[PDB]
Amino acid sequence: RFILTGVPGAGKTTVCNKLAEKMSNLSVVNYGDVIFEEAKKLYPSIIQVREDTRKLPRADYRNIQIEAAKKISLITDNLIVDTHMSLKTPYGFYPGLIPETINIIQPDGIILLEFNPRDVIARREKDRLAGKRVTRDMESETDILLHQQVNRMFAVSYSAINQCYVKIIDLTWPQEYEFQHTEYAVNKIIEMLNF
Amino acid sequence: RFILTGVPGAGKTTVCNKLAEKMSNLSVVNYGDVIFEEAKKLYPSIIQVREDTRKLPRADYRNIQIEAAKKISLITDNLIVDTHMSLKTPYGFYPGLIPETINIIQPDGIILLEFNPRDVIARREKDRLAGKRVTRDMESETDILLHQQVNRMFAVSYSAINQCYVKIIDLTWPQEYEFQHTEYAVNKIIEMLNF
Amino acid sequence: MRFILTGVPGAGKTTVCNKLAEKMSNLSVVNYGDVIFEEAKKLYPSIIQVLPRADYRNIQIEAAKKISLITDNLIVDTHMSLKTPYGFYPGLIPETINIIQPDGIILLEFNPRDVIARREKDRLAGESETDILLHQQVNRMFAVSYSAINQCYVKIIDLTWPQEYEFQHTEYAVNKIIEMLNF
């Protein structure tokens, strides 16, 4: 079991689904969908899209994270958990994982897909212009770089606390063709889990 | 409840005072000054300047941190705590926050004012030339960048541990007028407190 | 006092440890890796010549208790992380820090070029720059995490500068460290 993370809009789910393809024993589950479910279950009027959950107070937001972690420890087959290491809120960065949730999921490792902010912006803005996932953030190149290095710091903290590996997958290099990052990362991860 | 910090001599304080002015609902309190006073009240022969507070053994230093944190953990609706995230000691960096003081102060988040070392050196040496706070360390640009990055890493670790926010306010950009930095910061902080 | 001493591989960590042990009689230097090797050889009479990770952690704990027992100033040569096919794994686990009760961590931070040179030098007589810098930043973050949980010092010793003569880094680091132990 491994947690798989990246900045929003850089191709985290695409990699997850290609993995689910090339493997039969493993599942893929999006922690974000579960969080959305519980969040709208208790605050259906302020929550309308996924990003809205970031505006929630700390106490309620913690409750939602803890509830959402419940439906993943239900999974027993090898699993990859699509989630975030930190979330950009009006108040700053908020940890995607908190001791309760880490001890519930008990991940064997974390995987960080790190991109060049140019590509991330390109993908976010292409989806936005095409009327899809319109609600991601319009961030600067600098803001996205900051988000990524902060993701890294959070990951290392979690690892220091919980005996999990920290794998950094470098996708900063320029791509010859589309989804080259995706295939490369999928190949690296297949190599990892087969041992 | 937010802790407000920055490297020495970048203006952490000045920002706090203008906040206390520009908002009426909030109260601002200088945790660092209280630590200074406690330390030289209890060890008057070792501590004469503020930097002397950094050579204390960790056990005694911790006891003083906790004593000062009790005098300052208020129950106002909004509270900003002026302090440091890390301290340069002869033995390395020492955390400005510890689990005990976090549990006392109950902070919702940490706020890091990040400056460009050029401005920091400017302000430090300007005060030093005018006989103000002469004990401030004479540091290279690289030393100051290191101090800021280590502050960031501390903030992230505590956040992961205590489910708090980490807000990074970038003030490396050029300022048309002196203190432009300050107002920018103040404004964003108010935007945070009002939500 | 008690300090952990850590840095990227093959860059002169043990040379510094030995010169340290020399220039000071009051100090003790110990290699955590050797201690875990010894413990493993002693608890399982044959499995170990170069294990479940529960047992692995238990022997890490045993070695840490052996090191908890030295009286005087202590410097513990070990690593903040190890590069595995699955990613970086922390050298240290919370219980190890609670056992050793270190006053501080010291990170010897090098320039990847010199690291590569020293490595290949050892190779001829029996990683890229980016890989080495990543490992260094990760070590730094691990150190600050351990400090955040146990309130120990985090010292960064900069040895990225060019050497006037070889082993200058070594005596520089020893000078800084000796200056620390004497306060």
Ligand SMILES: Nc1ncnc2c1ncn2[C@@H]1O[C@H](COP(=O)(O)OP(=O)(O)OP(=O)(O)OP(=O)(O)OP(=O)(O)OC[C@H]2O[C@@H](n3cnc4c(N)ncnc43)[C@H](O)[C@@H]2O)[C@@H](O)[C@H]1O
């Ligand atoms: N742990 C946690 N704690 C608390 N709250 C949490 C939480 N986790 C989540 N939440 C909550 O939920 C929210 C976020 O949840 P979530 O919706 O899961 O995050 P998201 O990344 O913003 O959503 P996307 O699926 O749109 O992005 P993606 O990374 O999957 O990229 P994609 O593959 O689609 O591809 C992107 C686009 O680029 C294209 N593309 C993909 N790969 C490439 C490539 N290699 N080259 C070119 N284009 C590519 C794709 O076709 C597509 O068009 C948070 O704000 C918070 O509210």
Ligand SMILES: Nc1ncnc2c1ncn2[C@@H]1O[C@H](COP(=O)(O)OP(=O)(O)OP(=O)(O)OP(=O)(O)OP(=O)(O)OC[C@H]2O[C@@H](n3cnc4c(N)ncnc43)[C@H](O)[C@@H]2O)[C@@H](O)[C@H]1O
């Ligand atoms: N948590 C903790 N744990 C353990 N020990 C702790 C601790 N916290 C503190 N301690 C100890 O106790 C001390 C804390 O005392 P404390 O008073 O809290 O801080 P300090 O050490 O005095 O640090 P500085 O005053 O240098 O920073 P500042 O930016 O606030 O200064 P100023 O606003 O005046 O402004 C700086 C100068 O630049 C100028 N300036 C500011 N902004 C601008 C601008 N935008 N443009 C131009 N000039 C500017 C100002 O006018 C001024 O001249 C520490 O030294 C430490 O030893």
Ligand SMILES: Nc1ncnc2c1ncn2[C@@H]1O[C@H](COP(=O)(O)OP(=O)(O)OP(=O)(O)OP(=O)(O)OP(=O)(O)OC[C@H]2O[C@@H](n3cnc4c(N)ncnc43)[C@H](O)[C@@H]2O)[C@@H](O)[C@H]1O
């Ligand atoms: N907490 C933990 N958990 C789990 N496992 C743990 C653990 N702690 C430890 N371990 C285990 O310990 C094992 C190994 O780790 P460890 O024993 O801690 O270190 P190492 O990298 O394996 O040792 P090396 O001999 O390769 O190099 P060095 O860094 O000591 O530097 P050197 O002086 O030799 O220098 C090498 C070359 O550089 C040259 N050189 C040195 N300084 C200079 C200089 N200043 N100028 C020029 N050349 C120099 C030298 O002369 C030489 O040629 C692993 O199995 C690990 O698992």
